[PDB]
């Protein structure tokens, strides 16, 4: 009956809320539950079980991260060189910080490998360039 009481408590506490927050919960609940269940299974009894799958990095997860990064770039929030045009010569509904094993550190935009149409590497340090 305690579960019902907690449900009622949350229902009463829902008087102060925001609709977008409810939408976010509705969107992310399934993936959050899956990840939480896996994590709980891993550390059962506060002992490192030696039978659960190991935590390893994979290429598909990093591909998903790259897709999310390109989506973020389309909003004009950051600059990245992950697009295929730069060099020419499940669908989890959770924020990236829920999957630490798929994140790639960032490079300084001025030091990124970006190529023009011809095939030459563009120099990003326009301040220090001089004309012959």
């Amino acid at each position: 009956i305690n579960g019902m009481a907690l449900v009622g408590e949350e229902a009463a506490e829902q008087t102060y809320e925001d609709e977008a927050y409810k939408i976010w919960k509705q969107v992310t609940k399934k993936d959050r539950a899956l990840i939480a269940k896996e994590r709980y299974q891993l550390f059962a009894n506060n002992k490192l079980n030696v039978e659960e799958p190991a935590l390893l990095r994979t290429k598909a997860g990093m591909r998903r991260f790259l897709k999310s990064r390109r989506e973020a770039e389309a909003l004009g929030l950051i600059k990245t060189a992950y697009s295929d045009s730069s060099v020419t010569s499940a669908d989890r509904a959770v924020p990236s910080y829920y999957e630490p094993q798929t994140i790639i550190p960032d490079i300084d935009p001025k030091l990124q490998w970006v190529e023009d149409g011809e095939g030459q590497v563009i120099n990003q340090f326009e301040d220090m360039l001089q004309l012959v």
């Binding site: 010569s89 300084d108 490998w113 095939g119 590497v121 340090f125 301040d127 220090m128």
Partner: protein, 523 residues
Amino acid sequence: NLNQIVTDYLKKKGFTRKYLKAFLLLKNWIDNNLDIYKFELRKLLWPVFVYSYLELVSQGYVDDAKHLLETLRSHFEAVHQDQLALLDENHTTRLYRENKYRIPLNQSLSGNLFHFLEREADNGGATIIYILQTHCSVETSARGPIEPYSFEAIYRRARNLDLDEADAHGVTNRDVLDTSARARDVVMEMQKVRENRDRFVIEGRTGGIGIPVSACMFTFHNTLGTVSCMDFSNDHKLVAVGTMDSYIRVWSLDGKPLKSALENEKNLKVNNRKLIGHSGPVYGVSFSDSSKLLLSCSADGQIRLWSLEIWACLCIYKAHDGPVFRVLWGPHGHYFASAGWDKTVRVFTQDHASAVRIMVGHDTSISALAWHPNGTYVFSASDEMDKSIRMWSVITGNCVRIFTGHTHYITALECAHNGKILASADTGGNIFIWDIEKGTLIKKCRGHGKGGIPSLSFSAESNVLVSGGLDCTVRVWDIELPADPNQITPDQISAFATKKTPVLKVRFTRMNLIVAGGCYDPE
């Protein structure tokens, strides 16, 4: 049989069958913690300084005491002007000696401080431990951290409470907690901490796989195949490359402007510079132990010392007869070695224009060099008919070890940090691991392609090795495989491939990360 010959030869030869360092270290540790702890941590700076200064004065080293006073005066000039002026015997010194300083601290902070001091006992923490025991007394408390807006101070100010024994005894918390706004058992605590800490060591390795590492790659464009050598600074802030056009170029690895000590070049905006003066292709470069000096050698037979503060040459060394192929600083940066076409190895010091030691014994040109981590031995390798490695003594100048077994041109040499292992690679793709003391080969690693392995690097603990080859790959090896729980050798942990970029340099940082460099060629 060689054993018979050696036994006969041996038989025929009659062979019978001080305080400033500690203060700076403590200050550097203090500013690293969270801003909460720093308020209580700063209280330890003044007592330590005053007691160290008084001890140095009493011991008779008045010069050292004066040096300490003048060096640190700027730090406390804005708080204790009167005390510093007095320190320039009166009853103040007697009162300081009689009454031991009282400093309040929290229990968790005390534990962290004691653990940190124990961790660096031989590095300079023993001095602070002794000073704190003798001239100071800590009244540990279970309260929370004291801050102008923390729970403890707010509670004391709001509820109009009273000071405690620790708060009773020129900055005093009374001015803060008043309306106008325990002891310690060191020594015992130290053995006690050591006993507790000794219980958490790892003493085995069974099963599992190798260590995972990350890698960052720097690529150079539009070189047109004129780059001959590469090198990073010890802190990975600068990169230098020598070319076949006789000049050298240094860059900032982060793109920030480079700085020159010359006043006429005040605040100039450039992130790469050129060092000119060689009249032949440059084959070697070496950053000194930030780096302020640089060495280079070329095919014209000269070694040049450059300055990274004014960007100009300082001295020329003219000991060689023919091309010089490699040049290397010592492990600590006062001695350097060189070797080239005339089949000789020379050791220099930067204070003398002539080589202090000359090492004869090779029969062909030298193609590799390496120093021992202790700075008293050097390694060299020759090519062609005589493919052998030799270990020389810098004190006497004689050879003490020879390693044989290579069948191809030797390209790289490397010595482990522990000082007991040596690595070498050739153009056949092989990597050898040698035992220095016994002069015996331990094992061979395979997997690299033919062409050459220009560089090698050892992990911090000497348990992992990384190599880069001209076949556009970076590979990681396990020196010792894990104990079993009951074309490529099975000890290769990983292998990465580059996009048509031969690797000319690999380096291990403090972490499990490396930095590589190379030149990109579209063809």
